[PDB]
Design a protein around this ligand. Structure first.
Ligand SMILES: CC(C)CCC[C@@H](C)[C@H]1CC[C@H]2[C@@H]3CC=C4C[C@@H](O)CC[C@]4(C)[C@H]3CC[C@]12C
Lengths: 118, 582
């Protein structure tokens, strides 16, 4: 019923962090637990919609350098991002779907990651 | 009982019954039918005891799977509108056994179909409607079974002596419209109560009761859990309740028996102004037979969520005092939602319209059964027919019908693990597929004689009635205690048995018709899938299938659009399907 998330913080450029989003209080297995970031002054843009069978679908800007894998029987998505560049200074929500025709019932609270270039 | 105690709704109930009494006396003081009193009158069949009690009860027991019976009945309804009504109007006949008399030989086919239709009436319509009225009055006014039953008999005797049957166009279309609007309002109240739609999904899986421990005897967890793998349409074919091959094929042959061969369904639609009116009424009824998924099986699980103690009992010592039955009793899922989730301005209107739609479905079946008896059995045995004796034997026959139908109820209220849908289908499946097979092979194959179809019917009865007697003398039993039956004929499933009985009866009648003599083609011209114009010898209203070529076009586009919407609902509810975790 709630999407507990963690992992976000501060790191320099070129680093790598792991984003976690472990749902709780539900009985079903979720379908499309893909992450949705939000830049300040911008909307929610990118998809990482890993399916129930497991099929990643990135945006082209974060393609290749970002990976995502969930254990397919325990409802926890892990976004492992790599080679952090200073255009990723944004809050990163979680977003889930019950089913392939429901269009994102629940939502996340918000995890902000800030990357610097010192 | 407390909810309906208030005088405010009683005004609505009494003025609704005064309205139907007024239109009955207007009919008594005062065949060219339109498409809208045909569609509503076709939709209002099997409503009150197979759309409110049993359908919502099986939905509260299992889930979304029983809604597929509604779309199977939709497809067979459109098959009736396209195919079987031109066949019934080409041969110039009014029902099915008169058609078989004008197709086959002597009186034995007609009197066997009359006896079988009377036993199917007693087993599946009159007793089930009386028991559903008893559930309504018991959950509304708190009385016992027999007093509620005799109040229902008194009010339906007043309803049939008023004369509402002669104006069953206006009363049935008004009851259909009022009942559909009220059920839509109750669905909007029900989804507003649980907190949207996602809370309805999650809260239903954790909707167990709290009295699961009966001291020494403690039930397994599978009894009270709400079938946690089952929220989707197509279950497992082997060990799943309502299995998907068996569902589509068994409900196809059952709705082919019910929606095409029943003596009042086709006669309700044969009396019409034009064939295009019949097809338009069938498409309107097909649109209205699409809603009971979102109308009458989703509130069934709402009543599992809201009151998970009177709908999902496990323990008989307190379940007998809450619903009156020893085990399970999921039948009261819908009336508990009406008497608790309605304001006082509509709670009387719903219990008035869901009794008008039951009194009409009783006064139709009583008149049809009296017509069948005193025009197909007593007129064939006596063959003299002094008319005063005919009238008094019709009245004594329907009194005998009430006497047996009341006594059949304690088998019905605990027949199949509590449910009512699983009784109607389990009794229709043992006696309908022989009739469906004999009707299909009598229409299409055309090399069938009277010695084949009758013996196929008798062998189908000798298997199905044997299964029925062996079932009800033993019973399915509780989750903890398995049934004590020979399993190879007892426990495959009653849908798989319907398909097996249909195939066995078809093979037997085609073997017996291929052994003996054939039937000469020289007097089978209009009927039995042929369009010739030569005469025959054997044994204003519409006498055509014609319409304007524009109206045939718009009816064909509306029928293919209705199939598109139905296969869209099928392909939606089967594609997305929630699975639970370990
Ligand atoms: C109204 C929605 C819910 C269902 C749409 C289908 C029904 C209602 C519509 C679609 C096509 C229409 C039919 C097509 C044309 C004719 C021929 C005319 O001589 C009588 C009316 C009749 C038979 C129409 C009645 C209403 C109709 C059957």
């Amino acid at each position: 019923v709630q999407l507990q998330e963690s992992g976000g913080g501060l790191v320099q450029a070129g680093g790598s962090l792991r984003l976690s989003c472990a749902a709780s209080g539900t009985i079903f297995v979720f379908d499309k637990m893909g992450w949705y970031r939000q830049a300040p002054g911008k909307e929610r843009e990118f998809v990482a919609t890993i399916s129930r069978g497991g099929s990643t679908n990135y945006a082209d800007s974060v393609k290749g350098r970002f990976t995502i894998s969930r254990d397919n029987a325990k409802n926890t998505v892990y976004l492992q991002m790599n080679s952090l560049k200073p255009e990723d200074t944004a809050v990163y929500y979680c977003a889930v779907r019950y089913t392939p025709w429901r269009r994102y019932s629940y939502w996340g609270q918000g995890t902000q990651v800030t990357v610097s270039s010192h | 009982h407390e909810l309906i105690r208030n005088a405010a709704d009683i005004s609505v109930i009494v003025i609704y019954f005064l309205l139907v009494m007024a239109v009955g006396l207007w009919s008594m003081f005062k065949r060219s039918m339109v498409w809208w009193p045909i569609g509503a009158s076709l939709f209002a069949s099997n409503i009150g005891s197979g759309h409110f009690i049993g359908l919502a009860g099986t939905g509260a027991a299992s889930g979304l799977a029983v809604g597929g019976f509604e779309w199977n009945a939709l497809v067979l309804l459109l098959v009736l509108g396209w195919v079987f009504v031109p066949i019934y109007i080409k041969a110039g006949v009014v029902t099915m056994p008169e058609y078989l008399r004008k197709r086959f030989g002597g009186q034995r086919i007609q009197v066997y179909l009359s006896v079988l239709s009377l036993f199917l009436y007693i087993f599946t319509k009159i007793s089930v409607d009386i028991f559903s009225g008893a559930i309504f009055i018991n959950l509304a006014l708190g009385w016992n079974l027999y007093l509620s039953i005799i109040l229902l008999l008194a009010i339906t005797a007043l309803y049939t002596i008023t004369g509402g049957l002669a104006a069953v166009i206006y009363t049935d279309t008004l009851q259909t419209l009022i009942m559909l609007i009220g059920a839509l309002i109750l669905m909007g109240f029900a989804f507003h109560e649980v907190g949207g739609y996602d809370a309805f999904m999650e809260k239903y899986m954790k909707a167990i009761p709290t009295i699961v421990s009966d001291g020494n005897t403690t039930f397994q967890e599978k009894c009270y859990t709400p079938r946690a793998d089952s929220f989707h349409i197509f279950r497992d074919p082997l060990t799943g309740d309502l299995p998907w091959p068996g569902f589509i094929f068994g409900l196809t042959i059952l709705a082919l028996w019910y929606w095409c061969t029943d003596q009042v369904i086709v006669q309700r639609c044969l009396a019409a102004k034009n064939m295009s009116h019949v097809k338009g009424g069938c498409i309107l009824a097909g649109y209205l037979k699409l809603l009971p998924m979102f109308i009458m099986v989703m509130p069934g699980m709402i009543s599992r969520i809201l009151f998970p103690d009177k709908v999902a009992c496990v323990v008989p010592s307190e379940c007998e005092k809450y619903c009156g039955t020893k085990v399970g009793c999921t039948n009261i899922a819908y009336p508990t939602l009406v008497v608790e989730l309605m304001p006082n301005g509509l709670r009387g209107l719903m219990l008035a319209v869901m009794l008008a739609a039951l009194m009409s479905s009783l006064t139709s079946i009583f008149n049809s059964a009296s017509t069948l008896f005193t025009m197909d059995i007593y007129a064939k045995v006596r063959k003299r027919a002094s008319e005063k004796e005919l009238m008094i034997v019709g009245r004594l026959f329907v009194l005998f019908l009430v006497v047996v139908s009341i006594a059949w109820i304690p088998i019905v209220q605990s027949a199949q693990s509590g449910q009512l849908f699983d009784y109607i289908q389990s009794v229709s499946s043992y006696l309908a597929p022989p009739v469906a097979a004999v009707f299909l092979l009598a229409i299409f194959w055309k090399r069938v004689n009277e010695q084949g179809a009758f013996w196929g019917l008798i062998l189908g009865l000798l298997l199905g009635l044997s299964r029925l007697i062996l079932e009800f003398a033993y019973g399915t039993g509780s989750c903890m205690e398995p049934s004590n039956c020979p399993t190879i004929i007892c426990g495959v499933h009653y849908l798989y048995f319907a398909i097996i009985l249909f195939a066995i009866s078809g093979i037997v009648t085609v073997v017996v018709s291929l052994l003996t003599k054939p039937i000469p083609d020289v007097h089978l011209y209009r009927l039995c899938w042929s369009l010739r114009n030569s005469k025959e010898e054997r044994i204003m209203k519409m006498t055509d299938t014609s319409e304007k070529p524009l109206w045939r076009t718009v009816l064909n586009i509306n029928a293919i659009l209705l199939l598109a919407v139905a296969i869209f609902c099928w392909g939606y509810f089967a594609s997305n399907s929630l699975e639970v975790l370990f």
